[PDB]
RNA sequence: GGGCGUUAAGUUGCAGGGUAUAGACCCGAAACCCGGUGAUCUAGCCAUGGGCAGGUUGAAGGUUGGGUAACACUAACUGG
């Protein structure tokens, strides 16, 4: 992912624009990467070697979302509403 | 010597018997060729119009909500 894009996401989701390790920041980065690779996997359908990384990112995002939902539901709902997710 | 002849009158008309060529005592074919008439029936094609009551199952597809990182998949409705 682009360094400028990562910096923009960190500034948008974090507090001091330097934590860059919060659950919301990680989920946003994973979602952005998945959405960017959506167009890559819509053409190269025989790229399972890179699709495994996408699946790993999906699993990591799901685990982070479950942890956020278990810890603070208020932040989880706001994050999913902002990112357009459904669960 | 042997074969063919010599030694011995035919021809022209009429009538008739017979033969040949023509259809040839008479009727009767399936069939061949040439020139014409027929697609108002029927076979096909083209152009232009008309007709198929009523009652049935419910395909592709299209929204809705979930189900996927999303395509798939799947529930109802609609669709005809
Ligand atoms: Mg002599
Ligand atoms: Mg005489
Ligand atoms: Mg005579
Ligand atoms: Mg005619
Ligand atoms: Mg009818």
From Swiss-Prot:
GO molecular function: rRNA binding; small ribosomal subunit rRNA binding; structural constituent of ribosome
PROSITE patterns noted in UniProt: RIBOSOMAL_S15
Record-linked InterPro entries: Ribosomal_uS15 (IPR000589), Ribosomal_uS15_bac-type (IPR005290), uS15_NS1_RNA-bd_sf (IPR009068)
Organism expressing this protein natively: Escherichia coli (strain K12)
GO CC annotations on file: cytoplasm; cytosol; cytosolic small ribosomal subunit
Lineage summary: Bacteria, Pseudomonadati, Pseudomonadota, Gammaproteobacteria, Enterobacterales
Listed GO biological process terms: cytoplasmic translation; regulation of translation; ribosomal small subunit assembly; translation
Superkingdom field: Bacteria
Family: Belongs to the universal ribosomal protein uS15 family.
Pfam families hit by this protein: Ribosomal_S15
UniProt name for this protein: Small ribosomal subunit protein uS15
Keywords on record: Ribonucleoprotein, Ribosomal protein, RNA-binding, rRNA-binding, Translation regulation
Function of the molecule: One of the primary rRNA binding proteins, it binds directly to 16S rRNA where it helps nucleate assembly of the platform of the 30S subunit by binding and bridging several RNA helices of the 16S rRNA. Binds to its own mRNA, stabilizing it 5-UTR and preventing its translation. In the E.coli 70S ribosome it has been modeled to contact the 23S rRNA of the 50S subunit forming part of bridge B4. In the two 3.5 A resolved ribosome structures there are minor differences between side-chain conformations.
Induction: Part of the metY operon that extends to pnp, also has its own promoter.
Keyword Lyase: no
């Amino acid at each position: 992912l682009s360094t400028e894009a990562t910096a923009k996401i960190v500034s948008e989701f974090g507090r001091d624009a330097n934590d860059t390790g919060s659950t919301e920041v990680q989920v946003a980065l994973l979602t952005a990467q998945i959405n960017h690779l959506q167009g890559h996997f819509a053409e190269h359908k025989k790229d399972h070697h890179s699709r495994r990384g996408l699946l790993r990112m999906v699993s990591q995002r799901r685990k982070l979302l479950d942890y956020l939902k278990r810890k603070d539901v208020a932040r989880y709902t706001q994050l999913i509403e902002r990112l357009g997710l459904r669960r």
